[PDB]
Amino acid sequence: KVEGDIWALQKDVEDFLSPLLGKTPVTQVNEVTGTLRVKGYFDQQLKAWLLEKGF
Amino acid sequence: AGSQWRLQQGFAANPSGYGPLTELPDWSYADGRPAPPMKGQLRRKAQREKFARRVVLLSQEMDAGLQAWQLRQQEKLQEEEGKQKNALKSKGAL
Amino acid sequence: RNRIPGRQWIGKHRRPRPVSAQAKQNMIRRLETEAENQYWLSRPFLTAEQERGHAAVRRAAAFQALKAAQAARFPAHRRLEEQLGHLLVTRKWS
Numbered sequence: 574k575v576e577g578d579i580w581a582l583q584k585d586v587e588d589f590l591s592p593l594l595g596k597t598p599v600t601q602v603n604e605v606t607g608t609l610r611v612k613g614y615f616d617q618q619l620k621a622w623l624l625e626k627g628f
Numbered sequence: 629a630g631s632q633w634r635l636q637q638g639f640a641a642n643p644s645g646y647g648p649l650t651e652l653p654d655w656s657y658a659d660g661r662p663a664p665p666m667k668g669q670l671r672r673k674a675q676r677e678k679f680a681r682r683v684v685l686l687s688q689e690m691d692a693g694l695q696a697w698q699l700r701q702q703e704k705l706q707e708e709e710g711k712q713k714n715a716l717k718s719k720g721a722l
Numbered sequence: 723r724n725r726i727p728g729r730q731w732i733g734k735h736r737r738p739r740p741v742s743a744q745a746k747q748n749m750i751r752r753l754e755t756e757a758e759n760q761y762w763l764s765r766p767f768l769t770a771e772q773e774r775g776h777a778a779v780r781r782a783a784a785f786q787a788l789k790a791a792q793a794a795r796f797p798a799h800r801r802l803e804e805q806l807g808h809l810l811v812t813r814k815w816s
Contacts, residue, residue, distance in 0.1 A: 596793075600796070601796050601800075603800050606800075610797075689777055690767065690768065690776070692776070693777075694768060
């Protein structure tokens with residue numbers, strides 16, 4: 574459920590996840606679905622992030 | 629045939645390989661304009677460069693290896709004297 | 723009027739076939755190549771001691787490359803331009 578420039582979101586998600594992983598995380602962007610896929614379980618840490626940003 | 633003679637003389641076994649024949653840009657314009665470069669030449673320049681790069685890499689790594697070993701030995705011989713430098717004086721005497 | 727019982731080259735009776743001067747030439751040529759081979763195979767530059775871990779730095783990195791290469795595999799990004807781009811089938815010239 575993402576409405577907007579999803580690449581904008583992927584920049585931020587990647588940049589936020591990188592210092593934790595040590596490497597830039599693998600991603601699949603879907604513009605038609607409005608969907609982002611990220612490799613591994615980051616669920617817990619992503620909730621906390623999308624709360625901060627207020628989404 | 630006669631690759632043997634060619635080898636003794638220092639040329640290529642196959643007159644195709646690397647001789648003056650294959651290297652030169654066979655066709656040019658009337659005006660004298662240089663031709664668009666050939667594909668056989670191009671990829672060969674690429675791979676010859678790969679070969680050179682790797683000769684340099686290996687030679688350098690071998691010299692670095694030998695340097696490292698010598699260094700390690702000199703350090704060892706130096707630790708042997710560090711032993712003398714640290715030791716306590718024996719007060720046992722006859 | 724002369725037969726070679728059974729199959730020509732298989733059994734306990736075979737076709738007699740003789741060795742030829744050509745074959746001797748070839749065999750000896752190949753030997754000479756091998757002799758020259760082990761001459762050059764005889765004398766190492768570094769000793770066995772000296773060559774220890776001389777590149778463990780590169781050989782770690784090569785494997786990191788081999789790992790990253792697989793880490794990178796995921797289903798590719800799907801973009802807006804293709805789905806809507808398909809609509810171009812019905813383009814009308816009026």
